[PDB]
Design a protein around this ligand. Structure first.
Ligand SMILES: Nc1ncnc2c1ncn2[C@@H]1O[C@H](COP(=O)(O)OP(=O)(O)O)[C@@H](O)[C@H]1O
Ligand SMILES: [Mg+2]
Length: 272
């Protein structure tokens, strides 16, 4: 096996690693690194080329092709360089200092995020999805863990990441799965819109809308679209926001609005 991308020696020459691990999957790790020339912080995603005994180098090239396609889009993370060694392909990514948007979905920070801030973040997440949908790209993993912030004090901008599941239209955690995934119905752009309803639901209420005691109850709630819309949970959430979410959390994908229509919802129109 020959190496396509730059050599690992160049990486150790231009960049220094730190002890800071930003994320760790099964076959991927994200460590922080700094440029020896400029002292700028970057994020290095090490991806293993062999997963479960399969040479997965092709899928990594697919994820690079997608990142490269959406470089002009600022709602998508920027790819700067690529390096490769015997077992790893390394992606040098724009650093997102704010971290996962998952942080704001916790009651521990509900006191600093106002409805006006969610409107701005939701509007930003849509502009990225719109761009991706313009180019027949579907993310499929739009979970709060794969949506980051450029900062937190003050709240920064959106940066989408993790394109390991990006396909084209019409292709082949439980709580973030759409109901048409459980029916095996073909993929569709509307599948990403279901996940945006959960992001908005999780930010405004600070609770997951479908997770149950065990996975059995989780899958049931999804396939039944059983969501908690009670007054106790929405007593301090606008009705416009509710209309926005309910229009997205519906079982039939063809009924969910597109990314273009969502930007026209009366909830997102206000001088900020
Ligand atoms: N550019 C980045 N800046 C800061 N943190 C990142 C960045 N990219 C990824 N992370 C962190 O690493 C975690 C996992 O990265 P990800 O691209 O989703 O790989 P995977 O899902 O395959 O494990 C993310 O949830 C995020 O917390
Ligand atoms: Mg992830």
């Amino acid at each position: 096996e020959n190496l396509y991308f730059q050599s690992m020696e160049n990486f150790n020459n231009f960049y220094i690693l730190t002890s800071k691990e930003l994320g760790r999957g099964k076959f991927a790790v994200v460590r922080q690194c700094i440029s020896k020339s400029t002292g700028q912080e970057y994020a290095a995603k090490f991806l293993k080329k062999r997963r479960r005994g399969q040479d997965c180098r092709a899928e990594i090239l697919h994820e690079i092709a997608v990142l490269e396609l959406a470089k002009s889009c600022p709602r998508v993370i920027n790819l700067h360089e690529v390096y490769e060694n015997t077992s790893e392909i390394i992606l040098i990514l724009e650093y997102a200092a704010g971290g996962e948007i998952f942080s704001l979905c916790l009651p521990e920070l509900a006191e600093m995020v106002s409805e006006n801030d969610v409107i701005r973040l939701i509007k930003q997440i849509l502009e990225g999805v719109y761009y991706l949908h313009q180019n027949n790209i579907v993310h499929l993993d739009l979970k709060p863990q794969n949506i980051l912030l450029s900062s937190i004090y003050p709240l920064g901008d959106i940066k989408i990441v993790d394109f390991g599941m990006s396909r084209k239209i019409g292709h082949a955690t439980p709580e973030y799965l759409a109901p048409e995934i459980l029916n095996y119905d073909p993929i569709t752009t509307a599948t990403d819109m279901w996940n945006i309803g959960i992001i908005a639901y999780m930010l405004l209420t600070h609770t997951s809308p479908f997770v149950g005691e065990d996975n059995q109850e989780t899958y049931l709630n999804i396939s039944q679209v059983n969501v908690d819309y009670s007054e106790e949970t929405f007593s301090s959430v606008s009705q416009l926001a509710t209309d926005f979410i309910q229009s997205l959390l519906v079982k039939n994908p063809e009924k969910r609005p597109t990314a273009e229509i969502c930007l026209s919802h009366s909830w997102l129109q206000q001088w900020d």
